[model samples]
Target chain A: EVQLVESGGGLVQPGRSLRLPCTASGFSFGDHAMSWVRQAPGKGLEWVGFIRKTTYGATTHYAAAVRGRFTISRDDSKSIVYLQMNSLKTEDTAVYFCTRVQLDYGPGYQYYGMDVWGQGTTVTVSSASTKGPSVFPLAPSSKSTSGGTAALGCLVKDYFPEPVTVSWNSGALTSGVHTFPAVLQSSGLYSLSSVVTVPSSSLGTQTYICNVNHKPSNTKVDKKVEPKSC
Target chain B: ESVLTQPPSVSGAPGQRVTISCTGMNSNIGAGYDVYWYQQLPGRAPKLLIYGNSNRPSGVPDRFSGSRSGTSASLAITGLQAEDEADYYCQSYDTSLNGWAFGGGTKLTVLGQPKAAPSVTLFPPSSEELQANKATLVCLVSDFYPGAVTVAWKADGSPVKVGVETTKPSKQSNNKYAASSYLSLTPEQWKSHRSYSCRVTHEGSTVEKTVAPAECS
Candidate 1:
């Protein structure tokens, strides 16, 4: 029999480091290698990286935009591999899995994708320790000569505890802080939305910025929008 | 995803029935994906057993059955028949990770009954032995259960002191285990024409066969 055991669970706080463990039995580290994968709730699985037990080597295969905050390693004597993600945020909340790659036999033997996998462990992120409403700038927006008011949307499910700010590049705003309520989802837990309106006369291919402010580290996430009309 | 575990082999009488069980962890069957089963006969590739956890694959006989509970899946065979004695495996998907994995191999042995006087036929009964200038090769049991069964080199019907190195069982999605073993010999040992045989022992029945590779000089 082959077995892979995983450990760790529950919600994590922002800026904190998270580590999970996957252990195997009835198998030797020299025989098989282990890998880690992540899947957000209601989202598809993503490959993280693999750790070679024989050489004690590790590799990271996360998305290009994801920085080097994630790492995978193993302790062959204990038959356990550890997955660490530093500076975690709400976006890091998801289920993780460990797996072994498969080797194919043909005219020439070669290695392929993961064929065996471990039962996954789930992790959630919350702001129970932080204070205030978490906020960040909405992606920047672009506007053209339009007669009707245009609505811009931002996805603010991960930022929490810190307050967010929305700013206008051109001084043509008639109203501000038009709070658009949001429903909490299973993975994201909570969400909020807001919109800013500009008069058609001032909407001449101008750009608008939504600035968000948070505690400890004031980070920014941005998007652009263009409004056009005949 | 759910991971599965299987025994190396099991033995039974010709008229008795046998069962092989596969177990999974919390993330697999515990979460909700269907379990599956498969079989592999001697000298041939593997055949699908039950799909969708209990639904048999196309052309599978009714003798095979699959069932799942909180976190386990079982493949049961009734009418303990000789032909039915082979390797059985189980598989399942992990909902958390979105991947597949298989259990270890389980060899099923069929013992001949005393009263019935039924004949026992061994699949791939005989093996060929090949020897080379630096290698002594033998073909062990080709088709059998307990895929983890080992083939050892022996001299004069006795265990030959040889190194046995095995790789990890490679996993197939349908829940099958596959791996290979290698044995090396020195030139001095090959020149003496030291008799070498491949023996596969599973479920107490021993199948010893011999083979000579083309490289035998």
Candidate 2:
């Protein structure tokens, strides 16, 4: 059940700072150390730094690339570790991964490579070239039962500099709505999908719209299902 | 690689005991740091075996145990089962590096599993490649168990050392293993009417295939 999860990935303007969180579960937070590794788009992995806390205090180390601007800290009570960076730039656009570090005791106290990695969070630097997402038409569930509940899916894809919001036009629709986290694709773009469930009888009678907003570029796209389609 | 060190592999018969050793220094284990061991099954993520020096996580069989003495630690697996064959790694914190470190990983092989020899096939240089000054011979090794195999190339009954490449054994969909090796040579070598052979040695057994220049294509 041991797990590590990373959060706080999105677009950051030049000179802005960002803090990433790596939460630990199913283990004692203070029992082990944590490390950060990042991979720039289409590049190999680069070690960022690590932090370990003991009864005495905390020991931290950082790579020369982020020496003065990076910090690794943890909140043991909350079972979370953090990597904070200041004055980020386009060069910092990468997927930040966190891992649990353990010491191996053989002859003396020594350490080794990290185990237990988190699903990486993608951080991008916002520039004037930010690309807006393309919103596709709503797709109704194939199993839609007339007069019964039907689910609609909205897809937003191929966007740069993430943190896009997906919303539905029907606020009156209740429950059965879920939006997954944005996924960073190999192409350095982001994609996300959201699903909404509503009564099948309301399919054509009520106008349903899937709205996507990319704030950085002030781009908004609204799409709806076509006529005669579920 | 971490400051910790471990042997590349260990083997033992099922129902027997095997120990994996992890050696460190005064800045880590000798300093009273706890040792942790992990088991990584083939094609799967590593799972915690022993943590906090000698404690097993719930659901882990008690036959797997760990101990630390001075700056070194050992993981002992008693009554080893066939499913126990996997890679094992040890972890520790190094005060010297101000961080945690891991062992180079030791693979545990549970002996007595049914071993299968590989079928090796040697293919002569292709017709398309005969037009070029360079040519390549391919050796296909397939259908083996316990996936450890060494591939060798021979030119005219003599060992060919240069321009030879072999891949690590990969698991097949049939629950067996397969591997491939390639030998490169000049078209002139094939025209010399020499015989080429592929040799695969697995689990004390050898399988070989030969291709003579008479069938060159």
Candidate 3:
């Protein structure tokens, strides 16, 4: 397996410079070339540039639009790739990623399209946008137990900031119910779905609430219990 | 439009042979850019078939072959099979476009029947006179099954010959054949408005379509 991630999330002022780092493992860094791809909010993928890795002078292939505005380089000792660009604008706000390519004798017998992908790091150019995160209720991981207890889940997506507090509430429940950990999305945002099993006594009559907090925004939704349908 | 050019469709019955051609220009095949072929099934990503002209990967069958010369390249499949029915696209680099160019894609259908009939249409030009007078009548014959078909023209129920131009039956991405035939009217005959029609014979029945142009501008 391969992995690539930016060191941290970014929120930069206009006309400032930003360096995106991508640490690669599982293969020697300088033996092959790498590429950078970007995706704006709800947009298709865009090829930024590809860097040729060499001990001597390396080269790069740039998209016509990104040429002269960005530089893609790698540090051999650290096995880390870098993307640097300046004079940025709101249009530059996007999730950037570094991808892996293969040199093959197949077809064109050259470096082919990116196969292995990096985690997408989100970058916000403006102070902040008002678009709040989206929260949803997901199906539980499994069916009801023989004892008539069942599990329910809450899924949160497109949430902003580094960390968001998520908790569950029920009129008949206590604090002892299990809550899973939050997993990060490729866009450097939160995509968490927590599951909790309900007692047989609290099955139909209990109303479960999913409490999600992420400022500049806070959200909540009610999930109903359905033990008989299970 | 893509620099890589291919027919929309072609068909051949199982156990028979078929070929799909791709045309390129000085910025691509003529510029020595290597060509590649892909076989794509419905709702699936394309799989590489032949690359760098004739280098077949170990998994590719012997029936699939590719070759290129000058500005044209061809991918031929011998002993066509039902499983071989799918969309095939040609790809190559275009220095003019400064990027990869792709053919619109072609469909190779393994015909279940021996032959099929064609649907035809005719187009009338402005005014009846051939100034060389707008001297063209276009007949579009499409969605025919199998690969082989022919089209003829008639003027006022009389067999019209000469000045007839027909394109090679091109295949669509859906594995049906389509061809366009143009008839140039003589200066004297065009002015007569002689009830022009396009006649198509494929499979068994012949189809006749008279001009009533609309909709597709």
Candidate 4:
């Protein structure tokens, strides 16, 4: 499997320069090009550019409107590239990504954007020097069979003061609460699990996505499983 | 035939409006070819603001918008935010290069500060090595224009090159060219620890730079 490993965290004062690296392993530069993308505090994703390891060395395919403060470079020998931006502002605080190119075949060979993605790295730029918390809620673990009942489990630690909603999707449980958080362990952390029984007809044809809605923004995690006996 | 054709130049005011139009040689816009718009800040890398012609990338402001009509395409920035001022480029697949081609860039000068000036830098400095029976050194340029240019290696400010072979220009979607040169040196020349400079001559200006850590002993 191809994987993308991103640098951990970065803190840059306003007006300073920031350079981040995204290194790739288990892939060849001959087969794929590396791309950089940006995501804001509560936004989606933006494509920065991709590096061409063939001719001109590690350089970026920049957007037309991009300002002078940002740039990208790579080391083909090391399978690593650097994304640098100068005169950074608070607004520049966001998660940057390094991903592998996904090839698609149609009329001819073409790029279909990013298919396998990296679990992004966050970079915060600010003048106020506010401290960001380390209270990220763990994503719940779930398992479901195609034609049988599936149980989903989650644990919410004490640090998370806000309430979270757990929902399952399979075309049937779209509008009501199928289960609630049942406190199983008392480690001052909240443990909740719900089992949603699937009818035989709805197996293998529908998809189930688990979403966890939290403050500032919502996080979603999905798992697809086939019936063991179907 | 090229996939698209864009005007040589375009301009507008800070709060006023300007549009860069791209017309395709064929009906690429209709055949579901994905079109994208990028912003190259004076001296930085380009950023994707619009993709698939209409969908805005995550964090990009709504001021930057993309739309298509028939075989033509347009990128519009409303409210004309000050930061929106920069070189704007449009790109589409050529099906020929198996890659993307960029149009001549449009300079977006803000009515005010205009930010910092843009610049390009190369890496791996310089090096020398022996391949087969010839000594070689390679130099790379990150970002530049015209796509077509010349590169030379010089010794002690004088041209000290042997069998200089530069690769064909590769079109890097944002009006940037990725080109390199291979310089072969003689055994006697290689032993001298000669200093070499890779100079890129394009447009009117000549950027003569050097890289060290020669790839040979």
Candidate 5:
């Protein structure tokens, strides 16, 4: 069940910068190397570089093409990877993919290759643009017990040209619901938060869906959470 | 040793077992770094043969195994089949290089498959490029078996070492491989009318292709 959820799309003007995040689950992020690879429109794959937290500190290797403009880093404790690129041009327009470089250091020193990859984030170098949102749910805020209230949080991050809308499948349960504004990040992308609280007894076999709408792209992304057991 | 070492070739009969060794140093394998193996069949992309030194990817036959000791690792194929004939490579992190390192590659041959020689073609810089001062002579080596070959460039019969770059053999659409070498020179050097030759040695056979400015035009 290894999973990599990457940040969403971006539309930045030429000569600007971008920062994309990729978070991992179901594996030890600190133990493996992580790398970035990108592909331009209708082009072949190109390696940007790799970064690994070594025994002493960290080591990085980059291709000459992006060595000066791109930086790859990680937060092992949070199992998150970040890829930042500066001074982008139309030539840099492409989808950037983050991958886990599974290196096993045992009696048999082995490299499992990049077995898991993110869904990829598209970066378009343009003067004007439209970008969509990526939505996913966080762990439940409170314990699930009968007669108790459980807070469900959904994250909508790394969307551009946004003012996204968040709604629930269960009609207007607004008494315990809260939605936050689209806060812009240093990377020029926006992130928004929405939380919905419900009676624990109501989450039996029911599935709660978080719907996010990005008007710029006229697209919607749904995150489903199943709050079953107490 | 500083360089990751591997044998040039290893052979086995069908149903037999064979092993290829990759040796390194305290800065690498001896330090308990992970080793990986790859299999490159003719004209195809390389497939991961073994990972974590012992684990195989899905669809990789269990007969192909791997192991490691202090400073060295081995890739073993048991009950070898004809389809197993290909180039094998080992990879590991080199603390000395502070980067990922790959072995020179080992060619595994099924005893029954015949060894084939490479055909070498030395192409001179075009007249237009020759006048541009930034010209390169290309030497194409194709239709080679066993997938490994050594290439050398000569200028006027003397060794031409500088500004020469050669690529690893690439599998062709057929059951063969192709590689290329480039020799860059200035317009002044090309105007000298010196003879340039490309020599490719494959499995005890050698082929030489020579081209001169006189014949290029």
Candidate 6:
């Protein structure tokens, strides 16, 4: 079950030009080894480089922070792997992750980092105007007192870029009591209040949901918390 | 012989039985390719446990197994407890060290306070993404500890959000901890192969894992 997906994000101003997409599947796409990382919000993981293409294409190494004009492309028929970052600057707005590297030692193997992962994708360079994130799902839920609990929420209001990353699938009510706060709202657009918890033994059939993601319409929002039966 | 070679540490006591080695050479494990394994527990953040080369995906634990030959690959933990201390990594596909290479881990110790339980695996997202029901259903929680693992995602038994991404446990090397969760369906709920579940909870214990849409193919 090898996977890896990183669509694209929005609002790129400063200079223009950005193309992103890292989609791989079950396995075998030209054999492997491909990376493209970035994380600028609070800052931590940064190493925007790596691309190993060939079953016949040929495209190797480059991580001196990313040699030339930044280019990491591949189609491999659609196993897809593209990341072209040129003129864009506002600090290159962060949050972009796509990985699949497993190298070691050989006339055929290698290593260092990145071994399957893909979860970050926010890229707001700024031309202004932001509002890409709307996840509102809070099932037929409620049973809060300590025993088989329940009190879910997902009122992710208007979206801009304040601090959105509220999650939970708590299926079968694995055990709950979640939260994501900040009730006040503003206008270039910014707001979120995510809370989660489900376990009235997850009555009438296990289920719980709520989420919200943003980076200007790369898209992410899901709702479903219907607690009442059983 | 320097791209992926493991075995700098290995120990046991509780129930005894341990083996960890990831040797390579030839561009990668002797160029015969294939060799994947991961299990870090010193601050967490290394758990793909094993795949492709030896297989052990769902609820891993037939005593935890994996084996290979030519360039090398092995991750066998037959009983050892103390929660099986931690640190063991060995990946592949090096084309020659510029793509995927990891092997600088192998540290297991368990001769005392044993009480570990968290090893769940549920992956779905292939078969052209469940035939276009779109995809995302991954839940992997490794050997438990104070690691506080938690996860959930279901489709046929209710608990919908069509969206949920959970991660934040990391910390292995004995302190125990490892987590993961995700659920996003839309190819008509995986074209209706339906019924999915990946539930996990640590400490108090809880584990539910199911993935049969023929396992996304």
Candidate 3 deviant stretches above 4 angstroms? A1-102, A105-230, B118-217
lDDT assessment of candidate 2: 0.72
Fnat of model 3, as a fraction: 0.00
Q: Per-residue lDDT tens digits of candidate 2, residues A16-80?
A: 99999899999878988888877665333456888875553768888667889889998999999
Q: Relative to the true structure, how large is the alpha-carbon lDDT of every model?
A: 0.52, 0.72, 0.64, 0.52, 0.71, 0.61
Ranking by TM-score: 5, 2, 3, 6, 4, 1
lDDT for B49 in candidate 6 is 62
User: What shift in Å separates residue A154 of candidate 6 from its native position after superposition?
Assistant: 3.7
* Predictions in order: chain A TM-score: 0.54, 0.57, 0.55, 0.52, 0.53, 0.30
DockQ of all predictions against the true structure, Cα-based: 0.01, 0.02, 0.02, 0.01, 0.04, 0.05
lDDT of 5 by residue, A46-75 (tens): 557888655537677876667789898888
Candidate 2 chain B weakest ten by summed lDDT? B125-134
Candidate 4 per-residue lDDT, tens place, A1-230, comes to 66777884676677988777777887775466677766554233445667765554555676433347778777778877777777777767678767666554435645444444566778876544112112211111121222343322222212232344555553446542233332211122222322234554554565545444444234333333333331
TM-score of model 2 vs. true structure: 0.48
Error of 6 at A138 (Å): 3.4
Best by DockQ: 6
lDDT string for model 6 (A23-57, tens) is: 88898877776877665553234457777657535
lDDT of 2 at A14: 71
In angstroms, the error of model 3 at B45 is: 0.5
Q: For residues B110-140, could you state the per-residue lDDT of candidate 1 as single tens digits?
A: 6652211111111110111112222323121
Q: After TM-score superposition, what is the CA distance of residue A54 in candidate 2 from its true location, in Å?
A: 8.7
- lDDT by residue for model 3 (B1-217), tens: 3567887678887888899999999999999887777776643334568867777755689999999999999999999988898888776777876755667777777878545577554544423222223345555566677755668888778878876756556555456666766676554566565477788877567888764223111
lDDT of candidate 3 at residue B72, scale 0 to 100: 90
Indicate the TM-score of model 5: 0.51
